[PDB]
A and B are shown apart, each in its own frame.
Chain A
């Protein structure tokens, strides 16, 4: 390493990965609600029929 306080930046690199994967999960579950919506609308028109 360069620094011996780069042992502490291993821990911050670790959070960084977490923070950018939680961004990716918020946009995943909004695309999963958009799929449970078309399937809910698909079955709701049958209820009206």
Chain B
């Protein structure tokens, strides 16, 4: 806790993604733990 809301701009197929948060700072996050990458794809709001 807290799970920080981001907005997913685009995915990369190496288990990572580039989020731009509404709080400013972009982050090169990893898609790891309890996630399908088929429920990801532009426009998603994510738990970081």
Contact flag (A, B; Cβ within 8 A):
no
User: Interface on A for B, CB 8 Å cutoff?
Assistant: none
User: Interface on B for A, CB 8 Å cutoff?
Assistant: none
